[PDB]
Design a protein around this ligand. Sequence first.
Ligand code: F59
Ligand code: F59
Lengths: 810, 810
Amino acid sequence: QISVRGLAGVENVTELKKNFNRHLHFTLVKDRNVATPRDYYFALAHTVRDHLVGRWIRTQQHYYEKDPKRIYYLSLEFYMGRTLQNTMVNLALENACDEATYQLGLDMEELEEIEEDAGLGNGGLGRLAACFLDSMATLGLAAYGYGIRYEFGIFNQKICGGWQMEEADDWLRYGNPWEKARPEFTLPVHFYGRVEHTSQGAKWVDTQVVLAMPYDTPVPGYRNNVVNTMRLWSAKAPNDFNLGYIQAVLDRNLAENISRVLYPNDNFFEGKELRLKQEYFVVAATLQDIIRRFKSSTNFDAFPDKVAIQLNDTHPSLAIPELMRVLVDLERLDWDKAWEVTVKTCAYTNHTVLPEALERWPVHLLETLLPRHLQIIYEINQRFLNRVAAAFPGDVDRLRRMSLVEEGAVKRINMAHLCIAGSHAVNGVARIHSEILKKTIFKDFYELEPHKFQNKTNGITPRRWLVLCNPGLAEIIAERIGEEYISDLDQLRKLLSYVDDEAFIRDVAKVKQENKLKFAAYLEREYKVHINPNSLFDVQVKRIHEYKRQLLNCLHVITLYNRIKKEPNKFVVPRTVMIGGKAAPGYHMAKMIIKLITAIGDVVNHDPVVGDRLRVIFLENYRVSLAEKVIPAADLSEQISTAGTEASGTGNMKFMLNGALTIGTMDGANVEMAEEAGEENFFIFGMRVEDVDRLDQRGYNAQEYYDRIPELRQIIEQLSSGFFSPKQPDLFKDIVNMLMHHDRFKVFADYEEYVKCQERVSALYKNPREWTRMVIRNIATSGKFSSDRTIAQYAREIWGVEPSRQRLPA
Amino acid sequence: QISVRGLAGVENVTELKKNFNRHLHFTLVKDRNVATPRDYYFALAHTVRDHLVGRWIRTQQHYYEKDPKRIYYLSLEFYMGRTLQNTMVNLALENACDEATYQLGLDMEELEEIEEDAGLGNGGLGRLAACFLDSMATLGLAAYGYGIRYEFGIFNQKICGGWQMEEADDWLRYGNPWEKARPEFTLPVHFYGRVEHTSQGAKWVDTQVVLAMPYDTPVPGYRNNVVNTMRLWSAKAPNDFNLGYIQAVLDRNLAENISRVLYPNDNFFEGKELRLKQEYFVVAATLQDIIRRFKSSTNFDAFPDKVAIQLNDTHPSLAIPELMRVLVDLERLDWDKAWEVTVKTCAYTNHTVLPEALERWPVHLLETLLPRHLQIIYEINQRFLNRVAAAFPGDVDRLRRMSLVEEGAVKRINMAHLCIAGSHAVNGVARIHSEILKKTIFKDFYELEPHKFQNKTNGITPRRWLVLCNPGLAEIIAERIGEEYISDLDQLRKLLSYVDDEAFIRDVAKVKQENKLKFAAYLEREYKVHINPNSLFDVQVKRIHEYKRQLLNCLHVITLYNRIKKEPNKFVVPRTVMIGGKAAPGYHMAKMIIKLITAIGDVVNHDPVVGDRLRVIFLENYRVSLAEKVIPAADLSEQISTAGTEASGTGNMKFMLNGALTIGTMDGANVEMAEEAGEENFFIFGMRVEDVDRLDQRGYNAQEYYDRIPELRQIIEQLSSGFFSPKQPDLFKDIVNMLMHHDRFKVFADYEEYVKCQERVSALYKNPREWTRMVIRNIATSGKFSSDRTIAQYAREIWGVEPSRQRLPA
Ligand SMILES: O=C(NC(=O)c1ccc(-c2ccccc2)cc1)N[C@@H]1O[C@H](CO)[C@@H](O)[C@H](O)[C@H]1O
Ligand SMILES: O=C(NC(=O)c1ccc(-c2ccccc2)cc1)N[C@@H]1O[C@H](CO)[C@@H](O)[C@H](O)[C@H]1O
């Protein structure tokens, strides 16, 4: 049908059809008489998977022969989503498969909807790892993603009575056609025990053993015949485990609970033992695998020349003392040489400055679970603090500030401090974030070792986030400038010379309208909700957090509603306001925010006077597959975190690439997006970082805003009195109290500028031609935010490897 | 190489080789450079499995079109063993695969050894179910095996310091290529809750739900293109299970524990709740499947015309009240009609008369777990006892003896009494066993309903138990009488006309010698033990039980040793005495018996004066795959249970078919074996059932035997004084005490006749020609004990269906 989806050759279509029928028969053990749509999905999945195999085997043998430096990306999260369409895109198989299935009497899009998301992440951090894997393969790097194969990923969100309910994400129920179990590469991981000091070194003894079994998933590069590996560890009890008899067998579950479920608390660090076990489990198994591969090439001097380990946040920070443990206790290297190797091997990426999110493990936990690692951490701390004392003599307070060990009620290890000490590179994820790291939380560390601190602005893969989810837009772009932009996104700048092109303006606007119509139909078919497709699609999708200020959005919605009620016969630009995202199960305020959103919709959507002019919809179960649907349909992207709180954001970049205009604060990557597009082509409002600092010095008094803004006073009075909860008048008392007395994120302070800026949005939308021209200016300057650019920067400035766009033979 | 293994055609060998290479590449994702022997096994398994698929699909569609009466074999155990060689045999693929793998540079026998046994049974009862499935497929019956997919089967036995140690049988670790998951056929099973009585009947409400997910395994008939199904249920938590958040997800394990492990206690009934859940789980899921299939053909009058349910012991006895529950509570049939349907549908097979093995479930367990089933059982009991009272008026004691409810300390339900009341047929498993049922434990029931009671003498499949395990013997037989005996074992009688044939005598003896050499080599290669292959192979392999009298065997061994020590320079026929079998984990006396056997070997095998004349070996981890090895190598089969205790035995039949002579009591199927072969061709000794009864009336006094038999006195004195345990002199005090004071199985009473009979065995073995002629007389009359005969009798006399040897089109 469309060009970017590839060729549908006679030979290929015929071959795909027969391999499909072969899999339906031999693999699924079915005939066309008894086959369900799920059977048809699996037959297609297996057919496409067959095309990966040859390339997968030859890519790995290529790395063995050439022996390049290997990149190991360690993450507790890989938010992959669906794999089928992505594989077809990167293999240029999409049109061929579409044709093959069509001739078999099947609709491929219907079959694609049957695949479960691999929801092995919470949000931005997990999704970044996934985009990175795609870019590393596309850039021909010898890269491996290492993590945990959770049996249950991020919970499925159900909304019951306006409240979030959680249900287990049993994503493996029907099987996973993409993974290959490698039980022959199973590795032991040790826990508990005690440390014995012998004549010839320390020994970790009397440990409990859990087995780590790897599952490999192929990661295809974009049409370069490269297929890299994501290796995920599963927990297994050894066969003599606990070995009255019946209970011993049942108790094997305890060991296997390690890889059972993803922790969904992305807001607040809880020192839970099971999480600590997960963190060490992935680290210990991964590092044994790394060392084994390095030996199968005695001299660990060359280790950092052949190995780079990237730590995705502090979650795999135990890699630092674990590498020291292996080098010192097992390989018998002296401390100083082992430390040199470790530092040159490891690099650390930070993803937030919010203190409650930082991992600080109680010493008593590490003492019991990992006694030898604690000893190594103490030794790292002493040697590090000796360096600090020598550089800043007599500065006793610096010494306590920089210590890896935090004193107090319970002693704790600051894992971020560990990561900085044990890494040759530390990066933030957007320019403003990286500067904030150097100026505030890691200031002392920057003063000691300035050369360590870098920026690597985040990105998203244009394969999933344009070609896959928005083929209509990808095609109209390709008509003008060819196809090379898909793996060289900077080429989108060429679209600037089409900003006054009447045909292109019409096409850009047409694609958006089609996307909006398709999504409006999805909402009716799957959720029986009715929306006006001619309204402005105002969307905020992301995890529910106070710092992300979904609450500020809510105040604007109520403002709009109140203004309509005040002057009903006045014209307003119609809006569909969509808010979606999951709340961490223990985050009470976030769960109240969800209830508020649904409560507002309950009032707004049923007011006859409002009509089709304003609709408020909560997008249920927001996840990667839903993002791929809603983002192409958006007109307005809400990126309204308090300045200095969102490290980067990546949703922002997805919207920019897909033809939405952005209303946002100067926070995270928003700053760089505005810089690339031009501030005139961005809806910027609110306090900057400097303004927030000034308000903090003075003291933030929310009452001041309540007193001086009549429209805001009305909203608070409506909330308090039970306007949005008639049968439970005080339901939202916690929300009002927080806003009035303990709002860390200054919602009221940005209210006036936000409402004003929103009026400027509505004004522009009334001028369809000028709206679309501003959109073209955004798409055309979105190139910087390709994860190909981000990864090329990591490769050159941290890992010391050169990217390559060259093909491997097919 | 050999004829019975089929053709190795050019076309077939070429095709197998390319499908093997296809599976190694696409299925296993390996090349010949990195492939391990396990990879090669799996590639072969998948290649052979491909040949089953077409036949499997067409067999099931044939049953749909023809709609014959369906047989449902309900068992908690299916002791399947390995599947690869069995599949090749039944498909006539063995020589072709051997050739195909040979040309690829591989040894098929080596690859076969890599497959894990499906050890989903304890012993004879579980193995009977497996032989039955093979026979039903071979006889073209529309049969389904229904059971539980245990994650862990019978434990692997390790011998440490002469003691049994148990380790988990993680048989699914590397995956199972033979099964196909059918998550689309998942069914709910209910537990706990309460009964509500409404205007329009009883309702079972407020239940906890566990999901039952089926896995189908193909069961191929012998070269008839029939492939039947074994469906095994796996336990799954529903997705809203327990749905702080983390623990709720972890608690899903509790539901899934139902299908986790096989209960290994084949000796003594324990009322464990988890076992009760297993029993109901398989019954509830199976019966929903049955009814669904019956409807997909309103009128339950025809139900017994289209459905037969065979209960393998009382373990699935809950099928009776569960069928009543569905018919009455759900389908709204009246009690009397539902009961008529149930009785005509169900039949029950008993496997033992030992009272401690009988299932008697505490009422309080059924009250909590299955409240509605208890109510139905009480109602069944009342109506049944009303019939008893009407037939035998005034016989109050009969009423209490026949009651399904047993009074006492704890009230219990007698599941055997339930089974007889709710079945149109009740059978024992050998002629003497079935007579004992009518005369003793079920006497009252036989007097009420004599027409219900039948015999169905057990059998074994000649495919696994001759062709597969002893191809050398199968071939020399086929040379003389052709191949038709493999599915018509009665044809072996033709071998009687070769009893004086010098060539055949030489061949029969040659095959045995080769088998003995091969097994002697297996023992060195895998266990580093050294045996004389020219000695008589004296073997007793079976689960360790007091009634099976491994202890009597031990007394003979010590007698032989003592006689050698008394007269060292006297000639004795050399023997290798092999004893093997697992003990139930809680069975203390059985574990002591194992220790005794190893302790005897420790003394005997290291006495220089003995030399190669006597060796005592404990066969570790006895299981189906080991049986296939040791049975063809045996000269003497020990079947020495106390008369009236072994219901049938089936090991006895395996040995007879494979050229061992039998020393045994007149117990179980031994009686019929002696009858078929002639008592002159069998080594019969000891008390008959009548003699045991006489001794019980009088009182069994073991002291009498100790006082009057000097050779027995010596042994007991050796045991007591620490002769076999020098460092722990009183180690065997429990064994001596039991023998002297509380021996339920009269070991001393059969001692003299046993030793005497054993002398007659040694005498015959000295005459190789006459030994072999007696062997030929045994093989030639073993035809009755084919499970094809047993199943044809079930089909005609219980299920009301006609067997067919006709081919389905390929
Ligand atoms: O998504 C993020 N974090 C998480 O999801 C998260 C997930 C898990 C934890 C966690 C930490 C310890 C124990 C248990 C859970 C903490 C945070 N961070 C985001 O990362 C993106 C990629 O760099 C940024 O764009 C975004 O600004 C940032 O908030
Ligand atoms: O093997 C047998 N029984 C078992 O393995 C068995 C297995 C499990 C249980 C059991 C019953 C209740 C709870 C838990 C376990 C009871 C008995 N019985 C044997 O059956 C053969 C086939 O008919 C006979 O040849 C043999 O004589 C008999 O002992």
